[PDB]
Amino acid sequence: SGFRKMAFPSGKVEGCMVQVTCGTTTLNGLWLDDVVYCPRHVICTSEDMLNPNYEDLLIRKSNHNFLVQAGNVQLRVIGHSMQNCVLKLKVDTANPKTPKYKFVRIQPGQTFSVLACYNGSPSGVYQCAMRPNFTIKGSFLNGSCGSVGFNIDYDCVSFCYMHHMELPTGVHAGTDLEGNFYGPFVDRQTAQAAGTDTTITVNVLAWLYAAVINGDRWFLNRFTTTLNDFNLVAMKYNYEPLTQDHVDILGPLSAQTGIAVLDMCASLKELLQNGMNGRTILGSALLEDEFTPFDVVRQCSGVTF
């Protein structure tokens, strides 16, 4: 029993984290085979950061400008190129700890684990969802840039996020590992703000299923609803629309608990309308939306790595 925000074990990623220094700027890199991936903004100073010309800044740099440290060892950079907003530093040694891996782009609503690092040194691990507004509610201090997000699908690490910056509201923005930003953000210092965010409906339902599996059942009711009526309600409360695909994905949980998805939707309708009347669900007084259907099935089964 029990239900916790749970990250993937981080060991396979820990063995890939290095420190990258350019000029006065030091941040984290991801060393896979013979390439170190990091944010391109490592080449900037403060005044470059106002209006950086990355191509121009980069052409001016030599390999030896980039100091790459794997624990105590310096690696030798033998090449450097850019792909979108990520810098690729070719190094002379392949990482002997390189895991089976792929680069994947995730969709808003999906979760992943973040290994937060400072000076190439992993300090913490936590589980996040990509918000509908393409931010993540992370916990990041100065020196955290180049920290990465991932999932583990078997023995294979899917890398999905690299951290680039914090927004004024204290939430975080970054790229996939091909250097494409999540969200309408740029790696410069201009005014930038997160859009208004929405709740991930399908995830809330998943978490309500988790609650039921853990014996917490007071919010269930005799009523069912339709997708359309529910969605009329959801929209009003700044909830993402629930699609047929979402319903299908909850199928397993529905079968296991004996509560159909539109049955559970009627519960969620009531919770949005009435509140929780002083009660909690899985110890929480708000509806949790950072667990996917997959996460719930995983944690309420015991799949391992």
Ligand X SMILES: c1ccc2c(-c3nc(N4CCC4)c4ccsc4n3)cncc2c1
Binding interface with a copy of itself (CB under 8 A): 1-12, 14-15, 115-119, 121-128, 137-144, 166, 170-172, 214-215, 280, 283-286, 298-305
- φ/ψ of residue 280, rounded to 5: -125, 165
CA dihedral 277, 280, 285, 288 (to 10 degrees): -120
* CB nearer ligand X, residue 145 or residue 297: 145
Annotation marks residue 41 as catalytic: yes
Residue 9 contacts which entry, Na ion, a copy of itself, ligand X, none (Cβ below 5-8 A, type-dependent): a copy of itself
Query: Among 22, 41, 44, 265, which one carries the catalytic annotation?
Result: 41
Q: How would you label 201-211 residue by residue, b for 16+ Cβ within 10 Å and e otherwise?
A: bbbbbbbbbbb
Q: State which residue, 80 or 172, has the beta carbon closest to a copy of itself.
A: 172
Q: Provide the minimum distance between the beta carbon of 267 and Na ion in the complex, in angstroms, as a whole number.
A: 5
Distance separating alpha carbons of residues 121 and 146, to the nearest angstrom: 11
Among Na ion, ligand X, a copy of itself, none, residue 36 binds (CB under 5-8 Å by kind): none
Question: Which residue shows structure tokens 């089976």?
Answer: 100
Give every CB contact of residue 28 below 8 A, 6+ residues apart in sequence.
17, 18, 19, 20, 38, 117, 118, 119, 120, 143, 144, 145, 146, 147, 148
User: Can 300 be counted among the known catalytic residues?
Assistant: no
Among Na ion, a copy of itself, ligand X, none, residue 263 binds (CB under 5-8 Å by kind)? Na ion
State the binding string over 245-284 for Na ion (x if CB under 5 A, else -): ------------------x--xx-----------------
Query: Which residues are identified as catalytic?
Result: 41, 145
